[PDB]
Amino acid sequence: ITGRPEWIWLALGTALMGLGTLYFLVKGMGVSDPDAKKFYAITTLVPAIAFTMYLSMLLGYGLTMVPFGGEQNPIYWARYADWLFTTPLLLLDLALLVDADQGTILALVGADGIMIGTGLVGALTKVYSYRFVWWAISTAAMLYILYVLFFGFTSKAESMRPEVASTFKVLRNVTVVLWSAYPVVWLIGSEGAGIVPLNIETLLFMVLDVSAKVGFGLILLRSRAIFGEAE
Template sequence: MLEMIIFIVGIAIFSGSSFMFLILKNRNQRMATINTIVSFVTVASYMLMFDGSGTLMVPSGELVYWTRWIFYAGSCSLLMLEISTLMGKDKWMTVEIIASNIIVMLTGALASITEAASKWMFFVFSSIAFGYILYRLREGKTDKFLVTFTTIFWSMFPVAWILSPAGFGILNAAWTALGYLVLDVITKIYFGYHTTMHYQVE
């Protein structure tokens, strides 16, 4: 299947980015370390999807790779830690943002494996939690690039979900996998490189 090729490409790309961020630790240890772990977690996610474990077939015959959202709970929580740190959020707000992110991803996983009303109930719950994250990021000390980037590109994930076999099924599994890969590269590698090169935390 075409999505298997996409998963292999994802494994290769994020394996490369893992080593890139390891090298960049000499420049910005704290940010590069977080981004290294994010890339490693993403490699594991793509390996599991390539293996075919944790899939669900929807009535159209397309596969839903719902484990993606479980790994996002880990990798995106690290990104939320990074963003909160760079914005100077206090400890408890950071914990609140990370906890909200975990809720977003776990309810996203539940939306992917349930049907009918339950599916959309979990999707709405996930979207509300995501909206709350964006609200909290705008409170207190903030950063225009970080807020704008997160709002635009992270908002594309629920759009991709709606179009995917898990949602309305407008896109097949292969196109969905490609869309998620592009978003992963933008929100993890490009973003991580940008923060590592342009932000310093004492």
């Protein structure tokens, strides 16, 4: 395990996701409100899935070698397995907060699936120049998602409770900033142009992942917006 310099960040990531999972699990024990239960379920599952995939990367299972540029390049494929399930759960948290219509939710989840799926294909593609074609398609799917979060959701939040409108606005802003960093790190890291070494890349993704999951969850689950308006 320690044979890879990036192991320290995989281990820290595993620990922080594990701790985040346990914290949300305990916190949600005292919850009976049916609406709050939905948000706790979604939000606890996110770091639990990430915990398993960080562990698989730490132990070496979630790593494969991909030939491109005349080299055997270490590619952590387990990231995409994580993201396939956790990024639509994160979007679902946002969509339920603002009572999004079903068509909009399906558009978001579908675009998200395309985003992660094409990122996976790009990560595993052996023809170097083609990796960036997949990156571009994935990034276009991301831009669609960000567009919807701003010009379909923000003006939906404003007709809702003030506490859900303010909580949505904060989580929207956190999401757009954090999620936009992922394609940049991929592009300059070992999957793309290879300018930033894998150990630093792994650190960067770990900070983004913990912030986008445990950070996000801490903000959401401390808000009164997750509860039905009750006396």
